[model samples]
Target: SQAEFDKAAEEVKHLKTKPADEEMLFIYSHYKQATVGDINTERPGMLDFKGKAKWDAWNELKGTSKEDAMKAYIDKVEELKKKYGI
Candidate 1:
């Protein structure tokens, strides 16, 4: 179902309106976890607010498996899709 998943992913990218920071973070973490399985790079320094935020978001799912992360991301994407009706 890569085609379907890819479609959903594209739909997610094409959303007309912006989502909140928390929601964006949720999506970012799950997407990275799904595609990469865990954080690979070092955490950003304290002075790096944006980098630290993204690093922390992915870091929180450190132990999740690739499959689980993908499932979670898919579910969230569907939920967002329905919420935004896109």
Candidate 2:
């Protein structure tokens, strides 16, 4: 279980390395362009980019040790809570 959480954390890390435009999708998904079908469901032991980018980016960002990726994830979550009432 810890390994999977680490993997998910790594996935979030990649969000930090993407160009600002790509990374902003996480925020935009909440504020601007969410479809009715949009959902935040990740299967167990799965990594979902929400169709944003390569899964490797997560690992890459985390591998660097900065926390930007993790923070972006937090921002995304907060935005979603505001817009989608999650």
Candidate 3:
């Protein structure tokens, strides 16, 4: 099991690359929008934010810039995708 884990860890070292600031911001914004839903929308439904509510909550993150939000989301996805291979 240790060997298997080691092999897996070595395989995707490239994805370990961190997202650029701009890229991260984009993802963060999308994540926030998706989770909080557009207040202007007719229904305004929540998104698949999982357990990380801070990443999705708009009210709590008021005044947060789009760039920061997007970057956060991108980083998160990349991290999870690498670990889970999703």
Candidate 4:
């Protein structure tokens, strides 16, 4: 259920360690895709800096279903919790 995903969403903010960059990007992508579905806006081009990669990361999940994205986000949160201790 989305409620479980919601629980993880809150739990992520309280993590003891900041996840590595790739892990940060990974969950970011999942979170966006889970909530908003596919990418909709034009790619963030010049002057966007960090958003460029964030947009690309979310775009990479173009065809993912919402439930799957939520599931992945939930699972990744659990993995990170175990690996880095909440």
Candidate 5:
């Protein structure tokens, strides 16, 4: 399983197409969950739209197990690669 995840990790970086907003949000949430476990930083100010969106996405994934999050992230990346013909 680790080997699959390992390849997914590198393959994700080589994606040929940029993901849509919702897909980017999905990636952001899972990546943060896998790496940081939960949202640990303060929420951004109202003016900081981009930062706030990313923070909210990650916060929504709070309590998700790291392993599951990593697996889901890898799966999503692979799915996107296939869809985008990458």
Candidate 6:
């Protein structure tokens, strides 16, 4: 999924619309975790549901060694692709 991982970096850049209710955070977690897997890495608020979702997603992956985290990265990317009608 190496190719697929970074493809998402630019892939979801131009999405038609939000794929899921919690996507902001979903991609947030996956991206940072994967970025940490390659290299390291936010905050959100309740008022802004999307921001909260982003923080929620980031928190979900906490303390986990991101080895091969790209797997999930692409999983969500594919999820988005399917949802975006790619």
Task: Please list the C-alpha lDDT of all candidates, in the order they appear.
Answer: 0.78, 0.38, 0.42, 0.86, 0.80, 0.66
| lDDT of candidate 2 over 64-83, digit per residue (tens) | 22234334455564443344
lDDT of 4 by residue, 12-48 (tens): 8888999886788788889889998898977886766
Candidate 5 accuracy as TM-score: 0.82
Show pairs that collide, candidate 2.
14-57, 14-58
Q: Which stretches of candidate 4 lie over 4 Å from their true place?
A: none
Q: Which model scores highest in TM-score?
A: 4
Order of models, best lDDT first: 4, 5, 1, 6, 3, 2
Give per-residue lDDT, candidate 6, residue 82. Answer: 81
- For model 3, what is the error of residue 61's alpha carbon versus the real structure, in angstroms, after optimal superposition? 1.8
Error of 4 at 23 (Å): 0.9
Q: 1-86 in candidate 5: lDDT tens per residue?
A: 56665566667667788778788888878888887889987878556677777888999988999888889988887898788746
Clashes of each: 0, 2, 11, 1, 0, 1
What tens digits encode model 1's per-residue C-alpha lDDT throughout 7-78?
Answer: 556778987666777878888888888887789878885576777777799889999987677777787888
Model 6, 4-81: lDDT tens per residue? 888875677777766655676567777777776322324542375666566666667776556445777777777787
Q: All candidates: CA RMSD in angstroms?
A: 1.7, 13.5, 12.6, 1.3, 1.9, 3.7
**CA shift at 7, candidate 1, in angstroms?**
3.1
Runs off by more than 4 Å, candidate 6: 37-52
The lDDT, on a scale of 0 to 1, for candidate 4 is 0.86
Query: lDDT (0-100) at residue 15 of candidate 4?
Result: 89
